[PDB]
Amino acid sequence: APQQINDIVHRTITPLIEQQKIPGMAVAVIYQGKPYYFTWGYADIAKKQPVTQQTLFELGSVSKTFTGVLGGDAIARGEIKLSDPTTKYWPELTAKQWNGITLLHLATYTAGGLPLQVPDEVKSSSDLLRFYQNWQPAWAPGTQRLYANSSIGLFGALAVKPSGLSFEQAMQTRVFQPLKLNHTWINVPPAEEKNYAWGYREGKAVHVSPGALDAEAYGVKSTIEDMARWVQSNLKPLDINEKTLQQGIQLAQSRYWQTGDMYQGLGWEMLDWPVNPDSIKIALAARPVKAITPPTPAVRASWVHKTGATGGFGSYVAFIPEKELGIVMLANKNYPNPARVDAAWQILNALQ
Numbered sequence: 477a478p479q480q481i482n483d484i485v486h487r488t489i490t491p492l493i494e495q496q497k498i499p500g501m502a503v504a505v506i507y508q509g510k511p512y513y514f515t516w517g518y519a520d521i522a523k524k525q526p527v528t529q530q531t532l533f534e535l536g537s538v539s540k541t542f543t544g545v546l547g548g549d550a551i552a553r554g555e556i557k558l559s560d561p562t563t564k565y566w567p568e569l570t571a572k573q574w575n576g577i578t579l580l581h582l583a584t585y586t587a588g589g590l591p592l593q594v595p596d597e598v599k600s601s602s603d604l605l606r607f608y609q610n611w612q613p614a615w616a617p618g619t620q621r622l623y624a625n626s627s628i629g630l631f632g633a634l635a636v637k638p639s640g641l642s643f644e645q646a647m648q649t650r651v652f653q654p655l656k657l658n659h660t661w662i663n664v665p666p667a668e669e670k671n672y673a674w675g676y677r678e679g680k681a682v683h684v685s686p687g688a689l690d691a692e693a694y695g696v697k698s699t700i701e702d703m704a705r706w707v708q709s710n711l712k713p714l715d716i717n718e719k720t721l722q723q724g725i726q727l728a729q730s731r732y733w734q735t736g737d738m739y740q741g742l743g744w745e746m747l748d749w750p751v752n753p754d755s756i757k758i759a760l761a762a763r764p765v766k767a768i769t770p771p772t773p774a775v776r777a778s779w780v781h782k783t784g785a786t787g788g789f790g791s792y793v794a795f796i797p798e799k800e801l802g803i804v805m806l807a808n809k810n811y812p813n814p815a816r817v818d819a820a821w822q823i824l825n826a827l828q
């Protein structure tokens with residue numbers, strides 16, 4: 477670890493941890509391809525367990541990047557197309573508002589205002605169908621972006637249907653295993669529980685609760701080493717030996733819609749680099765989108781990123797392919813997103 481990387485990381489993260497009262501944190505910087513790791517504080521305060529490079533954190537919505545890449549892999553295999561109607565994979569979805577809503581719309585939050593959350597009351601498969609049947613779109617498809625778990629969650633579930641595999645099995649065999657993410661889990665096995673950090677919300681130890689379409693939208697747990705490898709894989713997809721996965725990664729970084737300075741991929745979100753740091757709180761934010769017709773293939777000169785939160789955890793991943801540079805920040809408190817971005821930008825800008 478170069479003293480430069482050490483100094484920029486410690487001078488940025490130490491005050492962040494102090495200001496935000498973060499109990500435990502792990503950081504990976506990917507610099508010229510190699511990962512450098514840093515850890516602070518506690519995975520479990522009461523049991524005095526430290527954060528290590530083996531600690532599991534809830535990724536929250538950073539899981540959407542795995543879903544987007546799994547869907548990209550299914551497209552590359554010829555199993556699905558983003559131009560396919562939703563009803564091709566869910567014919568039971570007969571209500572008329574679904575005519576015109578494609579897998580692209582689901583993946584990119586542009587279906588017309590699918591709800592932010594699947595209600596907790598939805599517990600059965602028939603509950604799920606009722607929910608989507610009864611939903612009344614606010615808008616025509618492809619006109620506004622409304623970030624939503626019920627949108628990308630449904631995309632993940634449908635994308636794996638032609639494979640015959642469960643979502644989890646598909647993710648494991650097609651993404652986690654080939655990339656050697658061997659400590660990344662949709663369900664944490666009993667053998668690995670010793671490494672699962674607690675999250676902290678108002679000083680209480682918490683873990684994310686089960687919900688419909690959780691795995692697809694917010695349910696992955698991972699370590700800082702596996703997350704560094706995920707960043708490496710998304711920085712340099714051509715190093716990946718599995719052809720459809722390499723292609724899937726590229727598809728997830730394609731630019732499908734534009735809102736302001738941001739471009740929506742599959743899971744990933746992107747801005748042109750160099751990026752105004754202030755250009756990189758609100759519970760619900762509807763924004764008109766412009767279609768990118770046709771989508772732009774992955775731009776190397778991009779700030780590519782994704783925030784994640786659960787009740788107890790705050791995560792952030794950002795990378796710049798043209799500079800072979802990236803960062804992962806995993807914490808067991810959900811602290812404000814602007815603090816994540818400011819920290820990540822301070823670190824990557826200094827190393828770029």
Ligand SMILES: *[B]([O])([O])C1=[C]C(C([C])([C])[C])=[C]C(C([C])([C])[C])=[C]1
Pocket residue numbers: 535536537538592593623624625684694759783784785786787
């Ligand atoms: B994700 O970590 O950004 C994410 C988003 C949401 C919205 C869509 C904002 C309600 C909800 C969650 C959970 C369900 C984990 C709180 C996560």
